[PDB]
Design a protein around this nucleic acid. Sequence first.
RNA 1: GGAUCGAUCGAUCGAUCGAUCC
Length: 635
Amino acid sequence: KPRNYQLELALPAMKGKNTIICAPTGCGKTFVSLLICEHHLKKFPQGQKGKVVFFANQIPVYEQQKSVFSKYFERHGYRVTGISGATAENVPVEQIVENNDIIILTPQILVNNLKKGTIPSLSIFTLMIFDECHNTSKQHPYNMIMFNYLDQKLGGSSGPLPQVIGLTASVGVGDAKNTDEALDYICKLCASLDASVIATVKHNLEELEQVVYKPQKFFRKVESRISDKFKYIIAQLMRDTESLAKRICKDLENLSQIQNREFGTQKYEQWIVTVQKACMVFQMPDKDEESRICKALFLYTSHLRKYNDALIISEHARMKDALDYLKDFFSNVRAAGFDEIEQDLTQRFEEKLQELESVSRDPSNENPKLEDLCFILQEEYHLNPETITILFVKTRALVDALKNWIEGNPKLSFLKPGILDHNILIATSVAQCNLVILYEYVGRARGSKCFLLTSNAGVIEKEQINMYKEKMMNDSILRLQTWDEAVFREKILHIQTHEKFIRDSQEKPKPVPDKENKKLLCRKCKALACYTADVRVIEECHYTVLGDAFKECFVSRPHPKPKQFSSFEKRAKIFCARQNCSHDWGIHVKYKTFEIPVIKIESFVVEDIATGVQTLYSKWKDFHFEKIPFDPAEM
RNA sequence: GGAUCGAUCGAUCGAUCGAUCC
Ligand SMILES: [Zn+2]
């Protein structure tokens, strides 16, 4: 039943103006959107038909919205449907939009349609409902739809424009420090979404917080370990590896010029990636020993990166977990390669393992952060044995490490694995949620706690300034609601005019393609893969090769997760067809009836025939050449 | 495969991590 609370948010939208309706409850926002849809479709006279559209960004929320809209809008006789990645194949989306009223298509589908030519004008709709509209920041599908909307509006051909009624939970601040910058950011959001009112409950505050978030904070700053024998042994191993890596590259310290680097930090991983991407462009004229040098440097650098990841895991998670990670990596790479370099590194790690295993089993080397984590878990469960806790972790390499720790720790047995009956649900990013534990990470059950565990004061200061930013965002929302409509509409119109101007400004023309027939080579092998004259672009995003000689240059491998995406269907991945390379080149797909190995320029190095410079690109867009379109008439 | 977002880190750009969509 619609209560007065759900109507105090819908009143500013039923009048016929664009809003930024915001509520902390999901069910509340859904019911408000349903009431707005009902009041908007029922207000039209006879002869006209409404085409309200809903924008869900995720598949689960899309399914929930489609289900609730189909169950609600039944007695009214409105055709409600939905379009996603599993429905926009060989269906005339124009026929779906023209013959429906409450379509709930995802925003990427509407962006693709507006780009293709289907649905030329955006005036076909009469009410747009953006779900979680605080994502309208930059280049987002919501922002691209709003760019088309503002271009058709300010362009001087404004037709029957639709209402752009939004829906969010937090208006968001971004990186504002003073109240002026937060007000500017909220005005920029309201301009990009083109709304004149920010609906927020200012009358019904009594029954607001009965069944809402109502969180709490229990910051717990901890210290790191001191008896770091494992870190010392791994640092000695990495120093030996880096020392024996300089036998072929004397200026390895010269290739990456940033600062002093230390083992076990993200800066070391960045230095590793930089020295990898810098030593992969050698131009030795032998082209035979140069391949061995590049492969040896790639192997040493991959081993250093794995050791650095193991150090970070041992710093955050347990020691046995980092040891298991290193053993798993070594066992996985042992079956792929059999060269003397891999043998040397594996035998060195095996020599160190006889002592690393004894060091890991030492009960006096337990992490203190895991210690007081299990302590606070024990005390909170002794306080209440029916608490469904969620433990957020930064890396996905630790969501399973902490699960193994919970399953192995004898001091606690009441917990169950809940990697995302299941008591604790160890997740990474997003129900009851009776307890949250942000472990090194930077809405119900009134009485729930939220413990933040970290070994750095940085996260504590960031959470403090985040609470201050939430307070200042509430104050700025009150200040904006205090304003009238005229000056606010003029301000948002000026903001969107300036944004349209600066957007028309940054228009990069077509870069002049090189008429030279440059070629591609593997990363860790430097073997001739294919000439760029043999590369065909499929849909301005995907690239493939049609050469018969290229068909034998790779080897297929079953994909761990195949899923078709509106154009193709995945079948397998492709690897380099050498003795001990096994380098990830791309993915094998089917377009309509053919089998095509679509490659990625990330795992490739470009070599020119004119000069001979070896360039390394990241994405296809940065790579400029004669993009020959895919011709099905050939093969 | 491609795009998008967020966090961290490093010289307006780049790297890593995580998530989303097509
Ligand atoms: Zn290769």
